[PDB]
Design a protein around this ligand. Structure first.
Ligand code: FAD
Ligand code: NAG
Ligand code: NAG
Ligand code: NAG
Ligand code: NAG
Ligand code: NAG
Ligand code: NAG
Ligand code: MXN
Length: 516
């Protein structure tokens, strides 16, 4: 409010200091090296560059190469596009069997995501026990929001869903608010009112162009070490040739390669569980039993309704929040090619008309799994990942509560106009896929287990309190930090990009304050 961004084209001014990793003149010594130009990595690198020489290394290319990443209309397209190793969406399947994606592009997952912007639940900070500078946290949210967050305009389906949330008892009406609070609200979006996507790469425009260099298609393969200290990285370019870059003096390497990429790189570099790394004949630099451990994926459960008259497609902006479930709905055109991981399997029925995807998210979650290496040498080979969905019964109980609330939502007068048949029950809707069950808990448990998908908000693998201290330093190693979604075991809110955008700059400011 007051400070929020305006509608405007995507600002690629920063491309004036973006270079192909094939350029050997980038090799040398910097004050900071940031690995991964994503949600946390971009504002971290921009912030550090205000005073110091920074090299940001990103394995993907620049978003201008894939224009459908730059509009709200292109959201499904990037997920429908086949993964050829260069596309901004990298496809994967967890060992649980659930299809999923991660970003491979400068800007990270903010370039492919659903655009929902929220600040962290204000209780999160005290829950962590970290000594946060809370005033600075809030100044930093405003720094991000001034650049890339707007108040969304009205969308007919979002307004329907918001009336339904309220009628179904998800109270109070919070109006327009960026805050994760119980009740129903319109939140911010990183899509602007013209549908232009804004993203973490635009925060590079706040860096000092004399101090910040960005290398794209830079695949960082290994952290180099010396008092055990990180001293640099090895990265390879798109032609396959290798390159080295180093930090100097009191500088530091920061890993911002995401929930999947950060544990992978730590393990490949010999930071990780001693018996596991020894089992792979990877030389142990720093034993730590928790690298790649405590990896979480909040479950998404859903139904799809097919209204008898067309509904307008929308981006998610209206949120229904309770402590035990977070709910939204997306409306979408039909398609004959599925957006990968929207549904949990490729063998899911295709919609022939417009549909509403009505969704609940389990908080936490309490179930967790791990990231392990698939290759002990090649960072381009994706690691194995398993989330163990619903292995914790509290998660299953919370999904049951969310699914019952979705039942309530389907029974509201707000959603009544979208039934195919004017009958009393919710079997008057036409469904794509499996409808909601029956009244007893056992049928809701079965529905939750069988039809789970990824919410895409996975986190963990390099936790504060396990791998990192409260300053995000890797314990036992000087000049090495981790800043991204690998760092916390629970969500900060229903939609975490806002927290991790903030976190990139905030830790950058903490580093600079430490320096001084
Ligand atoms: C489809 C989808 C939709 C989403 N929608 C929303 C939403 O609407 N709202 C919301 O709040 N959250 C959303 N999220 C979640 C949120 O966007 C992510 O949790 C968050 O962006 C993760 O930030 P990160 O910095 O941890 O990772 P990333 O943003 O993915 O950054 C990691 C970067 O590191 C790079 N990298 C990895 N390994 C290496 C390496 N070895 N060398 C060099 N570079 C490397 C990657 O290419 C990537 O750019 C969505 C997620 C997905 C998948
Ligand atoms: C980098 O250069 C190689 C040729 O040496 C080219 O194939 C590749 O597309 C370039 N990448 C970018 C991001 O410009
Ligand atoms: C930070 O902002 C939130 C709103 O997002 C507000 O509730 C809180 O009081 C603020 N905290 C401080 C320390 O200013
Ligand atoms: C590790 O190396 C030893 C030889 O030093 C060999 O016996 C063992 O099979 C190797 N294990 C792996 C997983 O490569
Ligand atoms: C906010 O976080 C606190 C502390 O973890 C939790 O008790 C509360 O339920 C959360 N509120 C919402 C609306 O998620
Ligand atoms: C690597 O991933 C493949 C999937 O293509 C899987 O079949 C294989 O078991 C994995 N190997 C290791 C060592 O993780
Ligand atoms: C679930 O998680 C909680 C907290 O982490 C833990 O106490 C419990 O043992 C786990 N398992 C089940 C089945 O609740
Ligand atoms: N992330 C996120 C949004 O909530 C979302 C967007 C599309 C489908 C499900 C959920």
């Amino acid at each position: 409010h007051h400070h929020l961004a305006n509608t405007s084209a995507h600002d690629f001014s920063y491309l004036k200091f973006v270079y192909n990793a094939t350029d050997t003149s980038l090799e040398g010594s910097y004050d900071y090296i940031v690995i991964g130009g994503g949600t946390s990595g971009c504002p971290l690198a921009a912030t550090l560059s205000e005073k110091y020489k920074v090299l940001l290394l990103e394995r993907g290319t620049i978003a201008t190469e894939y224009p459908n990443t730059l509009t709200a209309d292109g959201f499904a397209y990037n997920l429908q596009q086949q993964d050829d190793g260069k596309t901004p969406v990298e496809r994967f399947v967890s060992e649980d069997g659930i299809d999923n994606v991660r970003a491979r592009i400068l800007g990270g997952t903010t370039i492919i995501n659903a655009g929902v912007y929220a600040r962290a639940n204000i209780s999160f900070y005290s829950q962590t026990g970290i000594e946060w500078d809370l005033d600075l946290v809030n100044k930093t949210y405003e720094w991000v929001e001034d650049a890339i967050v707007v108040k969304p305009n009205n969308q007919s389906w979002q307004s329907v869903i918001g009336e339904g949330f309220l009628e179904a008892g998800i109270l109070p009406d919070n109006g327009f608010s960026l805050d994760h609070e119980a009740g129903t609200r319109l939140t911010g979006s990183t899509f602007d009112n013209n549908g232009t996507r804004h993203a973490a790469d635009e925060l590079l425009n706040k860096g000092d162009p004399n101090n910040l260099l960005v290398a794209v298609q830079a695949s960082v393969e290994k952290i180099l070490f010396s008092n055990l200290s990180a001293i640099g990285v090895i990265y390879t370019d798109s032609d396959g040739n290798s390159h080295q870059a180093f930090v100097r003096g009191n500088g530091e390497v920061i890993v911002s390669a995401g929930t999947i990429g950060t544990p992978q790189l730590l393990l490949l570099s010999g930071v990780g569980p001693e018996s596991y790394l020894s089992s792979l004949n990877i030389t142990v630099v720093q034993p730590n039993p928790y690298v790649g451990q405590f990896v979480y994926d909040n479950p998404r459960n859903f139904i799809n309704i097919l209204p008898p008259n067309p509904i307008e497609a929308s981006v998610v902006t209206v949120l229904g929040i309770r402590s035990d479930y977070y709910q939204v709905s997306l409306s979408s055109l039909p398609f004959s090619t599925p957006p990968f991981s929207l549904f949990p399997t490729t063998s899911y029925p295709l919609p022939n008309s417009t549909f509403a995807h009505i969704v609940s998210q389990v908080p936490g979650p309490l179930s967790h799994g791990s990231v392990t290496l698939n290759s002990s040498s090649d960072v381009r080979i994706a690691p194995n990942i398993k989330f163990n969905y619903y292995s914790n019964s509290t998660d299953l109980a919370n999904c049951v509560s969310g699914m019952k609330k979705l039942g309530d939502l389907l029974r509201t007068k707000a959603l009544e106009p979208y039934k195919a048949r004017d009958v009393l029950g919710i079997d008057g809707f036409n469904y794509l896929g499996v409808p909601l069950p029956q009244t007893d808990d056992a049928s809701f448990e079965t529905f939750c287990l069988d039809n789970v998908a990824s919410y895409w908000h996975y986190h963990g693998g390099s936790l504060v309190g396990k791998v990192l201290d409260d300053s995000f330093r890797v314990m036992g190693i000087k000049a090495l930090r981790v800043v991204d979604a690998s760092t916390f075991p629970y969500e900060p809110n229903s939609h975490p990009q806002g927290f991790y955008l903030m976190l990139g700059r905030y830790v950058g400011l903490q580093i600079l304050q430490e320096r001084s």
